[PDB]
Design a protein around this ligand. Structure first.
Ligand SMILES: [Cl-]
Ligand SMILES: [Cl-]
Ligand SMILES: [Fe+3]
Lengths: 285, 298
């Protein structure tokens, strides 16, 4: 009756009934329940967080009342469209992980959104997020996206996750000047390019692609992790591109042609003496 | 194992077991190095044992866990917490739900503490990409960082693939492969490796049985194949085996036989997701190669 945090994780509940008894609830957790629709929540006007991770909700609705909501998670449901969030202006994080969403819409009014999570969906393009100026983390991995584009407005974005998509060219990153972590593994990229402005990158991952040569990253002097396993790199001289990164600690290069060299680990250590981790294993001295 | 290793290992297992009996939802927050060390140390042990494990009874064989950490705890209450019993898990330890880290950390810790009495096979959820699985990657970055998931794929890439118990029970996560002619081909699989979308290693983690199929058929999953009862029978005769013990599919009672009890499917996650109402089972083998099935309920 008097709790700021209420947790009904794994309670078999199949319907939202009788939550008006909670006076000043601030966090409501309803994960791994049996909810089939959103309802009977218009009274809990003190909520910052609502958690509906892993249910069977098929449409977003009945949330317009809770305008102090700051964190909303409707992951692992059966959503097909994004809607009914236009009134939650103080939303900072929004998780819609692993649904059946196909298009990015209806988020234009969430100006304070710091993290958008649309991983494991059926999205095919990046659109309609020019308005999210405060976005710091964008997660679109495991989708059907085919081009990097409408990202030019997110100048404060620091983490871009785009693994497991249908990309074929690195482009459209010209304005992400504060970008710090870039994940593009499991795509169809063949050339490293288009990173001229991302000087503050510390974590870059282009593993599991079809890249033949390391280029155009000699200016990335802040690199701390370079993940490039499962590509087609063949020339040890390409590692000259990374010598400006004096704090480079980890590189992944295994299952490249380079690893056929019986001096593979030795050559990495000679080229990049600051590196402490090569693939899974530490450099042992 | 060093005494300093035992000290930190028991500290981790203690804090992981301390939430037992609590009202589910408690997570236990370990430090990043504790989780990372668990990955590195267990990976070294995986590489120091064959990729085709040859185990002897007695041991307890379990199917999927799917990150349901408190249901894993209940399994250990029925079968006995290590080292009171020997365990062989058949894969799929992580999934959706925000308690996959506790599940894998407890399994990895017991693997390090009892490396010749505790065993983990690789499931298709222990892959090195998010081409088809997002929950475990999602949990890692939300509680820690993406690199932690990367370190986990390093450990996953070194898990063993199949096991043969007392020269008579073949164990894998998925099932048989049309490319599988000899046990040597499994031994030829090299680590670290990810799970391909095609080939022997893929089928060992992905294939299913089917009543309808007579030989090899296509899989409604979009990967690998389906095999029928005849496939099973020729396989046991060619390799002089008695049983295929596998997981990977939800079954009503946690266990389910196939091809006149020549194959069995085990599933150890009760009420998977939520729309199902299945039980978890567990097959126990004793010194005389006798199989008994214990069933866990929601
Ligand atoms: Cl053989
Ligand atoms: Cl090996
Ligand atoms: Fe599976």
């Amino acid at each position: 009756r008097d709790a700021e945090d209420v947790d009904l994780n794994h309670y078999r509940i199949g319907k939202i009934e009788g939550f008006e008894v909670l006076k000043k609830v601030k966090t409501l957790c309803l994960r791994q329940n049996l909810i089939k629709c959103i309802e009977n929540l218009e009274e809990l006007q003190s909520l910052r967080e609502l958690d509906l991770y892993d249910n069977q909700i098929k449409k977003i609705e009945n949330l317009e009342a809770l305008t102090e909501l700051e964190i909303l998670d409707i992951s692992f449901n059966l959503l097909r469209n994004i809607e009914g969030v236009d009134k939650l202006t103080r939303l900072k994080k929004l998780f819609l992980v692993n649904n059946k969403i196909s298009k990015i819409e209806n988020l234009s009014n969430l100006h304070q959104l710091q993290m958008l999570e649309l991983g494991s969906n059926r999205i095919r393009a990046i659109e309609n997020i020019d308005t999210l100026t405060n976005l710091e983390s964008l997660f679109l991995g495991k989708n059907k996206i085919t081009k990097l584009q409408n990202l030019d407005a997110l100048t404060n974005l620091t983490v871009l996750s785009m693994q497991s998509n249908r990309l074929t060219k690195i482009e459209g990153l010209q304005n992400l000047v504060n970008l710090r972590e870039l994940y593009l593994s499991h795509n169809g990229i063949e050339v490293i390019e288009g990173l001229e402005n991302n000087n503050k990158l510390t974590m870059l991952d282009i593993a599991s692609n079809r890249i033949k040569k390391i280029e155009n990253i000699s200016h990335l002097t802040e690199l701390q992790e370079f993940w490039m396993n499962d590509n087609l790199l063949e020339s040890w001289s390409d590692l000259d591109e990374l010598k400006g990164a004096r704090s480079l600690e980890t590189v992944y290069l295994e299952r490249n042609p380079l690893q056929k060299d019986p001096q593979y680990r030795r050559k990495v250590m000679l080229a990049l003496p600051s590196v402490r981790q090569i693939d899974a294993t530490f450099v042992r001295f | 194992m060093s005494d300093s290793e035992k000290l930190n290992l028991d500290s981790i297992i203690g804090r992981l077991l301390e939430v037992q009996g609590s009202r589910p939802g408690k997570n236990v927050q370990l430090t990043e190095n504790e989780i990372r060390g668990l990955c590195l140390k267990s990976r070294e042990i995986f590489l120091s044992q064959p990729i085709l494990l040859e185990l002897e009874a007695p041991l307890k064989i379990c199917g999927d866990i799917h990150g349901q950490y408190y249901d894993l705890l209940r399994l250990f209450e029925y079968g006995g917490f290590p080292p009171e019993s020997n365990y062989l898990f058949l894969g799929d330890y992580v999934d959706r739900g925000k308690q996959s880290l506790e599940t894998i950390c407890l399994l990895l810790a017991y693997k390090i503490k009892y490396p010749e009495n505790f065993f983990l096979l690789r499931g298709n959820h222990e892959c090195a990409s998010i081409n088809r699985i997002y929950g475990f990657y999602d949990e890692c970055k939300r509680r820690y960082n993406i690199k932690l998931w990367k370190t986990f794929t390093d450990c996953f890439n070194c898990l063993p693939i199949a096991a043969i118990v007392d020269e008579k029970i073949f164990c894998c996560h998925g099932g048989l492969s049309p490319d599988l002619q000899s046990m040597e081909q499994i031994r030829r699989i090299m680590r670290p490796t990810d799970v391909p979308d095609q080939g022997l290693l893929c089928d060992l983690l992905w294939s299913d049985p089917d009543k309808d199929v007579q030989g090899w058929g296509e899989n409604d999953r979009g990967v690998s194949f389906t095999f029928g009862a005849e496939v099973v029978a020729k396989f046991l005769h060619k390799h002089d085996l008695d049983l295929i013990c596998r997981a990977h599919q939800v079954v009503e009672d946690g266990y389910e036989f196939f091809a006149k009890r020549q194959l069995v499917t085990l599933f150890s996650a009760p009420n998977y997701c939520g729309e199902f109402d299945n039980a978890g089972a567990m097959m126990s083998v004793d010194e005389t190669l006798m199989c008994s099935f214990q069933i866990l309920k929601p």
